[PDB]
Amino acid sequence: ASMNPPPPETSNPNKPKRQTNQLQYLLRVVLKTLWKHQFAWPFQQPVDAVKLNLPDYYKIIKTPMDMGTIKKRLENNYYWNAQECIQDFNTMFTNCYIYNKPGDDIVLMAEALEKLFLQKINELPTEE
């Protein structure tokens, strides 16, 4: 195979929606802070394995995830639980570590973003 898969779903009108202080925090503080990090750009959209000429990317990574998708999910109220969003961030980081090798610059970039992510998640507000 060579083609990219369709990108992850970001909206589903059939799913119930709610606003919570934790979901708001995840968009306003966590996602936004990570987005503006200098090393954020490789994580701001789905991996285009065609453009990058990486035909094995989607043979190795079967649960792709990226911050562009996460951001849109938050904006579309796709997540009911903060934990769903946190899981998507963790999937993004682990995919990077699984596909690439320890010494790669892209892994260094991911590790920097992850450190910041954990700092912000450690400050997650108690549910209101």
Binding site: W41, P42, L52, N53, D104, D105, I106, M109
Partner: peptide
């Protein structure tokens, strides 16, 4: 690698 220089 190219993954850290283009998207």
């Amino acid at each position: 690698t190219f993954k850290s220089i283009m998207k």
